[PDB]
Design a protein around this nucleic acid. Sequence first.
RNA 1: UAAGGCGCCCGAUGCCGACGCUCAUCAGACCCCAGAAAAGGUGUUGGUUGAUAUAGACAGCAGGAUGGUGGCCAUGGAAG
Length: 153
Amino acid sequence: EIKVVYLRCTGGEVGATSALAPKIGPLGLSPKKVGDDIAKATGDWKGLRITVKLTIQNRQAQIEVVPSASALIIKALKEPPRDRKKQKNIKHSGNITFDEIVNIARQMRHRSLARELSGTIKEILGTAQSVGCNVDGRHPHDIIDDINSGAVE
RNA sequence: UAAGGCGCCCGAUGCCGACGCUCAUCAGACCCCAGAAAAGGUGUUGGUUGAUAUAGACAGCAGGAUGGUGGCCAUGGAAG
């Protein structure tokens, strides 16, 4: 029977304290094989958590990845992924390109949960500061960039 | 007449007294004088000052009460 389950996975980094045997266990597939297939499928994040769905069947489960608007910004921030020790105050420092902002805006538009494309850029800029980064100036300046200099199609 | 008094002891309001204030399960009641403070009261009576009201109050009841987002630096999970 077709069943969907949502897992806030670690991504490519394989987890030791797993919460996968509580859910997939009564469904049928080996939860250690569950943890191994998810870590191979996401891949390109390798440092980030993604809320991925698992469209499971009776014989084997399959993988389809759903990135969030906050999940796609930290993806573009090319930072070196570190070791397990996880040094404190990792809060990111860098510059994001303005083309990538429309790239999620077109991606959020295809996911079809938003305002028209003009309104998509503000709800991704409203989360860019929630990611904790700036584009040559924070969203206060981007409100200035939104009005009378809108690069919207 | 003074200072004191004038329900009764106890002489004098047995004034058609005036206007208020206060309810005390510890009421209060006249210099020296014989007993109380800080603090507090949505008890009640005054005031002071500043805001709210046909561009609609204050309660009251009944309705949205979400959303990018189940935000992330993330803690096994924290999605108000």
